Design an enzyme around this catalytic site. Structure first.
Site, PDB file in Angstrom:
ATOM      1  N   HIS A   1      39.463  15.149 -80.091  1.00 25.07           N
ATOM      2  CA  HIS A   1      40.921  15.219 -80.133  1.00 25.07           C
ATOM      3  C   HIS A   1      41.592  13.850 -80.082  1.00 25.07           C
ATOM      4  O   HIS A   1      42.497  13.570 -80.864  1.00 25.07           O
ATOM      5  CB  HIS A   1      41.435  16.041 -78.958  1.00 25.07           C
ATOM      6  CG  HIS A   1      40.946  17.456 -78.944  1.00 25.07           C
ATOM      7  ND1 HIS A   1      41.174  18.335 -79.983  1.00 25.07           N
ATOM      8  CD2 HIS A   1      40.279  18.156 -77.998  1.00 25.07           C
ATOM      9  CE1 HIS A   1      40.645  19.508 -79.686  1.00 25.07           C
ATOM     10  NE2 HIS A   1      40.102  19.428 -78.483  1.00 25.07           N
TER      11      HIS A   1
ATOM     12  N   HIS B   1      43.993  25.560 -81.517  1.00 21.73           N
ATOM     13  CA  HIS B   1      43.315  26.588 -82.320  1.00 21.73           C
ATOM     14  C   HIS B   1      44.326  27.386 -83.138  1.00 21.73           C
ATOM     15  O   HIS B   1      44.105  27.661 -84.325  1.00 21.73           O
ATOM     16  CB  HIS B   1      42.479  27.519 -81.449  1.00 21.73           C
ATOM     17  CG  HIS B   1      41.412  26.803 -80.687  1.00 21.73           C
ATOM     18  ND1 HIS B   1      40.805  27.340 -79.575  1.00 21.73           N
ATOM     19  CD2 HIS B   1      40.853  25.581 -80.875  1.00 21.73           C
ATOM     20  CE1 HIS B   1      39.915  26.474 -79.101  1.00 21.73           C
ATOM     21  NE2 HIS B   1      39.924  25.401 -79.872  1.00 21.73           N
TER      22      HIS B   1
HETATM   23  C1  LIG Z   1      34.945  22.034 -77.276  1.00 19.53           C
HETATM   24  C2  LIG Z   1      36.007  21.174 -76.562  1.00 19.53           C
HETATM   25  O1  LIG Z   1      36.435  20.099 -77.407  1.00 19.53           O
HETATM   26  C3  LIG Z   1      37.230  22.037 -76.233  1.00 19.53           C
HETATM   27  N1  LIG Z   1      36.939  23.133 -75.344  1.00 19.53           N
HETATM   28  C4  LIG Z   1      37.390  23.124 -73.980  1.00 19.53           C
HETATM   29  O2  LIG Z   1      37.910  22.127 -73.492  1.00 19.53           O
HETATM   30  C5  LIG Z   1      36.922  24.306 -73.182  1.00 19.53           C
HETATM   31  C6  LIG Z   1      36.536  24.177 -71.816  1.00 19.53           C
HETATM   32  C7  LIG Z   1      35.993  25.351 -71.143  1.00 19.53           C
HETATM   33  C8  LIG Z   1      35.881  26.616 -71.825  1.00 19.53           C
HETATM   34  C9  LIG Z   1      35.312  27.700 -71.113  1.00 19.53           C
HETATM   35  C10 LIG Z   1      34.808  28.591 -70.511  1.00 19.53           C
HETATM   36  C11 LIG Z   1      34.181  29.579 -69.804  1.00 19.53           C
HETATM   37  C12 LIG Z   1      33.602  30.409 -69.174  1.00 19.53           C
HETATM   38  C13 LIG Z   1      32.887  31.375 -68.417  1.00 19.53           C
HETATM   39  C14 LIG Z   1      31.870  32.171 -68.959  1.00 19.53           C
HETATM   40  C15 LIG Z   1      31.207  33.095 -68.150  1.00 19.53           C
HETATM   41  C16 LIG Z   1      31.527  33.211 -66.795  1.00 19.53           C
HETATM   42  C17 LIG Z   1      32.528  32.416 -66.255  1.00 19.53           C
HETATM   43  C18 LIG Z   1      33.196  31.499 -67.064  1.00 19.53           C
HETATM   44  C19 LIG Z   1      36.265  26.733 -73.170  1.00 19.53           C
HETATM   45  C20 LIG Z   1      36.814  25.554 -73.852  1.00 19.53           C
HETATM   46  C21 LIG Z   1      38.053  22.541 -77.392  1.00 19.53           C
HETATM   47  O3  LIG Z   1      37.624  23.434 -78.152  1.00 19.53           O
HETATM   48  N2  LIG Z   1      39.286  21.952 -77.732  1.00 19.53           N
HETATM   49  O4  LIG Z   1      39.884  22.440 -78.800  1.00 19.53           O
HETATM   50 ZN   LIG Z   2      38.610  23.782 -79.847  1.00 22.72          ZN
END
Ligand SMILES: C[C@@H](O)[C@H](NC(=O)c1ccc(C#CC#Cc2ccccc2)cc1)C(=O)NO
Ligand SMILES: [Zn+2]
Ligand SMILES: C#Cc1ccc(C(=O)N[C@H](C(=O)N=O)[C@@H](C)O)cc1
Length: 300
Positions: free
Chosen positions: A265, A79
């Site tokens: 990715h 990001h």
């Molecule tokens: C999109 C994918 O490719 C990817 N995202 C992730 O792998 C990912 C995994 C988990 C979270 C999270 C969370 C949380 C929470 C939470 C909320 C409320 C209460 C407790 C925990 C965010 C991103 C990504 O954006 N890569 O760039």
């Molecule tokens: Zn992302």
């Protein structure tokens, strides 16, 4: 001559790590011409440098990471990396006193403000662009990504979601890249996750920095975040943010037409490496004449 750019001054921010749930201090530093983007861990002693390079990427369960020769890693770089591309930063050292970049609000926008705080220093050395001159395509079953020759930078991203909170009219996004468009259309789009999976990970001591403050979280049926979405199509905008960060792992802006279907990715990185490996599929170009520079890459 279109010149390489770095920061004017050192800046810092703090935030929690997605993995560790601990406070991470992020320091961004100016760097000289041609040195590129370097991520650096300073928790380890001695510190470890991870030049951003397509071959060094790994698509980990959460987000992405860069590895060194000993498989030491730095995580969640993509990001911030997308924000570097958005603001046209070529050379920079990025330090964290931890194994990961802070997740912030799940988007690139907090990094945009941090980079603006740091300012721009134009360096007296031509900025090199990777110009696509042959069509290059990669595939993973039903998924595919391709670059085609095009005098500009465009991204045409379709995601294939079957979640109820994501409508059909919200599954594709396409844009002509520019600093302004990245900042206004893309940078605030947050990452997302499935609550049960996150719960499972946190029950195993992982993803401990996860919260509503750093991601869109859905259950089987709906977005759980009280305020809902920043954009009706935030999910696909975020995947375009990710593509921009993935592609900039080579440290150069690409002049070409990017199209992807259900990509992510791993496939994006597969495309990047495929292009770079094919010596005749691309060439470096510079712009001694500023006016030749494609609209997409004009300064912010
Ligand atoms: C999109 C994918 O490719 C990817 N995202 C992730 O792998 C990912 C995994 C988990 C979270 C999270 C969370 C949380 C929470 C939470 C909320 C409320 C209460 C407790 C925990 C965010 C991103 C990504 O954006 N890569 O760039
Ligand atoms: Zn992302
Ligand atoms: C660790 C871990 C871990 C990684 C991925 C999953 C996963 O694929 N979960 C499923 C899913 O549908 N997620 O949206 C179903 C099973 O909910 C589950 C656990």
């Amino acid at each position: 001559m279109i010149k390489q750019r770095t920061l004017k001054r050192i800046v810092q921010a703090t935030g929690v790590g997605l993995h560790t749930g601990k406070k991470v201090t992020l320091t961004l530093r100016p760097a000289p011409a041609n040195t590129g983007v370097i991520y650096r861990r300073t928790d380890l002693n001695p510190p470890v440098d991870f030049p951003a390079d397509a071959k060094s990427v790994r698509d980990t369960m959460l987000c992405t990471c860069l590895v060194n020769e000993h498989d030491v890693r730095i995580s969640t770089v993509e990001h911030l990396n997308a924000a570097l591309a958005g603001l046209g930063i070529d050379n920079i050292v990025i330090e964290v006193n931890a194994p990961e970049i802070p997740i912030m609000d799940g988007s690139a926008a907090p990094f945009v403000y941090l980079l603006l705080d740091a300012g721009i220093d134009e360096l007296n050395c031509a900025k090199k662009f990777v110009r696509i001159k042959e069509t290059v395509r990669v595939e993973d079953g039903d998924k595919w990504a391709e670059f085609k020759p095009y005098n500009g930078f465009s991204l045409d991203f379709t995601i294939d979601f079957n979640h109820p909170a994501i409508d059909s009219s919200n599954q594709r996004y396409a844009m002509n890249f520019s600093a302004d468009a990245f900042m206004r259309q893309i940078s605030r789009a947050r990452t997302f996750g499935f609550m049960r999976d996150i719960e499972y990970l946190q029950s195993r001591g992982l993803c401990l920095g996860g919260s509503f403050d750093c991601a869109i979280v859905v259950d089987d049926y709906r977005v759980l975040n009280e305020d809902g979405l920043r954009f009706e199509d935030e999910f696909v905008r975020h995947k375009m943010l990710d593509a921009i960060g993935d592609l900039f792992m080579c440290g150069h802006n690409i002049i070409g037409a990017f199209t992807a279907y259900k990509s992510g990715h791993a496939l994006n990185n597969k495309l990047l490496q495929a292009v770079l490996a094919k010596q005749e599929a691309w060439e470096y170009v510079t712009f001694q004449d500023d006016a030749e520079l494609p609209l997409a890459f004009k300064a912010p």
